[PDB]
């Protein structure tokens, strides 16, 4: 019945002056009573916010006195409690059926990257009502989906100027323009116009040939109209989405021996093995980051020709993402089933518990410390980097270990009374995950884009 607590937080807009100091003393209080104390008219005056509490870097799932009986520590000690916004669980909402596997998902929102990029210029500046969801299929077809899950627009087919084979990745670079890439080695830039009645049109603006190999990954900059790609040739591409400024194509990569065909500006091969992911730096748009099966994450300078830094990891890397200090922190999805959090400057921690390859990542739109990943094991998992344990002995190495906060399964499989997930990824494989405020859309082998939100 007497225990000292002290409140600290990393949360940007929730902070206590002066009141951090003082004693909570039923001593049997679950996280609930504490979340109530913070919400108090006296403390944060917010009053409903669910708060989770981290001691030592671990969540408190019991009462206080139980925690400090079972560990040790019924020392009258002052437990230092980090408090964080408790995750609002992304439960299942909708599913958009496809004919073949869903390789890629992107979300056009008012606050999504293409959405903020839009309102600058050219600019639809998409209204809070109508959000659009892009899906790329092994069909060879892009589909612009309604928020309510109907198909507004469908890409042309092969003939008529569309993709000649499966599409590996696609994204919104603005509300007018969107970009795709695939097994046909092209990178295609599309105009998307929409009518009064809800129906779309996707007209190819540009066919871009630099690559010999599948173009596996694509990232976009809507401000500078730049695209960059990662391909199985072990090479990272850099392109202008604008027809205006482009070089002329290689012509020995073209369908020989209407729509405009242009080449890359600054196509480089920096990798021994296929290049799985390439992304822009959030702060600086002339700096890019590469990841390949050659185990390397490379800091790359797009202004000059090539690589300013190389960082090598234990296992081949299938994916990369940046988390916003003046500069990012990378999540690297591995074929080794875990995610390594990498600091590119001259291996902080490791997220564990995926059962298969980790092929897609995306940061929370809400806070810096949260991340969602997606994986060939049929699930997308939500991590909080503020949740960290000193590494376990087996396979643990340096203490990095962080387990998932929430687990998102396929409603394809989950709706069945079945017990354990299918071996490998069979039928459930998750190829793409994007996390927006609508939130957590998941493409994959089950031919469905899946919507999870609270």
């Amino acid at each position: 019945a007497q225990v000292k607590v002290i409140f600290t937080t990393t949360e940007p807009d929730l902070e206590l002056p002066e009141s951090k100091r003082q004693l909570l003393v039923p001593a049997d209080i679950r996280r609930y009573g504490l979340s109530r104390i913070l919400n108090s008219e006296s403390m944060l005056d917010t009053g409903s916010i669910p708060f989770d509490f981290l001691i030592n870097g671990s969540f408190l799932r019991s009462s206080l006195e139980d925690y400090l009986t079972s560990n040790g520590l019924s020392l009258e000690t002052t437990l230092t409690l980090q408090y964080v916004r408790s995750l609002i669980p992304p439960v299942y909402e909708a599913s958009f059926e496809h004919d073949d596997w869903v390789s890629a998902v992107d979300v056009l929102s008012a606050t999504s990257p293409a959405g903020r990029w839009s309102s600058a210029a050219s600019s639809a500046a998409v209204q809070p009502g109508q959000e659009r969801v892009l899906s790329a299929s092994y069909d060879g077809l892009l589909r612009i989906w309604n928020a309510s899950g109907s198909v507004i627009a469908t890409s042309p087919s092969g003939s008529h100027g569309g993709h000649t084979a499966s599409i590996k990745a696609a994204k919104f670079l603005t509300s007018d323009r969107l970009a795709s890439a695939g097994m046909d080695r092209t990178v295609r830039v599309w105009k998307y116009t929409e009518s009064d009645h809800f129906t779309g049109e996707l007209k190819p603006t540009l066919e871009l040939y630099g690559h010999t190999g599948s173009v596996d990954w694509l990232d976009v900059d809507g401000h500078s109209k730049h695209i960059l790609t990662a391909s199985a040739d072990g090479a990272i591409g850099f392109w202008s989405a604008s027809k205006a400024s482009a070089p002329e194509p290689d012509a020995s990569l073209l369908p020989g021996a209407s729509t405009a065909q242009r080449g890359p500006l600054g196509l480089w091969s920096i990798h021994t093995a296929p290049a799985t992911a390439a992304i822009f730096d959030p702060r600086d748009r002339t700096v890019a980051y590469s990841a390949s099966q050659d185990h390397t994450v490379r800091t790359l300078d797009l202004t000059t020709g090539q690589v300013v830094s190389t960082l090598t990891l234990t296992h081949p890397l299938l994916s990369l993402s940046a988390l916003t200090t003046t500069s990012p922190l990378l999540a690297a999805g591995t074929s080794a089933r875990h995610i390594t959090m990498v600091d590119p400057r001259a291996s902080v921690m490791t997220l564990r518990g995926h059962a298969n390859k980790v092929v897609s990542l995306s940061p929370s739109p809400e806070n810096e410390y949260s991340l969602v990943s997606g994986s060939h094991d049929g699930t997308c998992r939500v991590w909080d980097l503020r949740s960290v344990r000193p590494a376990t002995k087996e396979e643990g190495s340096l203490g990095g270990v962080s387990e998932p906060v929430y687990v998102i399964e396929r409603e394809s499989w989950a709706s069945k009374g079945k017990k354990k997930r299918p071996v490998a990824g069979d039928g459930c494989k998750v190829f793409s995950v994007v996390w927006d405020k609508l939130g957590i859309f998941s493409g994959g082998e089950d031919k469905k884009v899946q919507v999870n939100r609270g």
């Binding site: 596997w101 010999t212 093995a273 296929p274 299938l318 069979d426």
Partner: protein, 350 residues
């Protein structure tokens, strides 16, 4: 565990859509693609990580495709498959194939325009991309490429005539050198470094020399009916496996006797393959759906004890119609492997 890492532990990708057993697996020289021959007579090429099938062809209306093997050169992208008596050379449609690489492969196969007869196949086959049909006298079990990809040998067990055939892709030339083998030839392998050759019968494995044309060595594994074998990249060791459930490591530095004998299997061992590309791993495939993954290390110094320990047993293949795992191949760089079982599936392990 320990220093024995890494190795395949779990199966990360399942390869489906063959009907009836899958007879063969060969990974693309660049490591981005899988090739599977079927009992349904289809050769197919699949995206390695995802398990999406990007290409397929049916060579013969009714026959099984026993062996598929890539031309071990990264500048070509040429696949060889064996259906019955015929060995087909083809160029699968893949993202890897540009018009330059296509024209290059076509230039290699078309260059060069009876123990064997080299013929252009039916129109329907180049319509689907198969440029060559090479016919030998009796059915082909095994195919092996020489490391620079100009020569390839086909082994046909039944017919003594064509049993071991060495083909030259430049001159379109089938030959039956070192003609009569004293045995029933299961399969054959070229040497990783020096111009040597290997021919395994059910008896024993015999290492020849090509244009000196002489028998160099003969190693006797001392087991019933050798099922298969594979040569260490170092060249100074190899591994044999049999229908006796036993695996035999042969050190050719020391003796014709097997250096080590290993019983990990309930039923016959139908395939054995080393990891070529420098990792201390090899594996055997069994008629129980298990793979047995071993660590073994050809010593840094010549004439030293190879250290061999089993690291992991991979289950999850289904024993179907009396048979287990029928084939194995390894990724070129990474410690991943792919197996061909009778499930009608191929499976990726990491």
């Amino acid at each position: 565990p320990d220093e024995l890492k890494p190795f395949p532990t779990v199966q990360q990708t399942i390869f489906r859509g063959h009907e009836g057993r899958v007879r063969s697996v060969a990974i693309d020289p660049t490591g981005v693609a899988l090739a599977t021959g079927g009992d349904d007579g289809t050769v197919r090429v699949w995206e390695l990580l995802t398990g999406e099938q990007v290409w397929s062809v049916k060579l013969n209306g009714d026959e099984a495709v026993n062996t598929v093997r890539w031309r071990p050169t990264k500048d070509t992208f040429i696949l060889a498959a064996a259906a019955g008596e015929d060995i087909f050379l083809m160029i699968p449609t893949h993202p890897s194939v540009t018009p330059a690489l296509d024209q290059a492969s076509r230039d290699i196969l078309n260059a060069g325009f009876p123990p064997g007869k080299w013929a252009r196949p039916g129109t329907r086959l180049e319509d689907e991309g198969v440029l060559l049909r090479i016919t030998v006298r009796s059915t082909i079990k095994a195919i092996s490429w020489h490391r620079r990809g100009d020569h390839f040998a086909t082994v046909s067990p039944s017919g003594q005539r064509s049993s071991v055939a060495i083909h030259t892709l430049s001159k379109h030339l089938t030959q039956i050198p070192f003609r009569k083998l004293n045995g029933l030839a299961q399969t054959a392998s070229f040497h990783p470094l020096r111009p040597l050759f290997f021919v395994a019968t059910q008896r024993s494995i015999r290492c020849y020399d090509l244009q000196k044309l002489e028998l160099v060595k003969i190693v006797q594994p001392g087991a019933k009916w050798i099922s298969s074998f594979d040569v260490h990249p170092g060249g100074d060791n190899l591994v044999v496996g049999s229908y006796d459930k036993r695996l035999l490591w042969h050190d050719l530095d020391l003796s014709n006797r097997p250096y080590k004998t290993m019983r990990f299997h309930t039923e016959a061992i139908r395939a054995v393959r080393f990891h070529k590309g420098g990792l201390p791993l090899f594996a055997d495939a069994s008629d129980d759906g298990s793979l047995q993954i071993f660590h073994g290390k050809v010593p840094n110094d010549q004439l030293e004890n190879p250290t061999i320990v089993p690291v992991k047993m991979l289950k999850g293949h289904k024993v179907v119609n009396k048979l287990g795992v029928l084939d194995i191949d390894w990724h070129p760089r990474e410690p991943w492997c792919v197996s061909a079982g009778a499930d009608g599936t191929a499976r990726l392990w990491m």
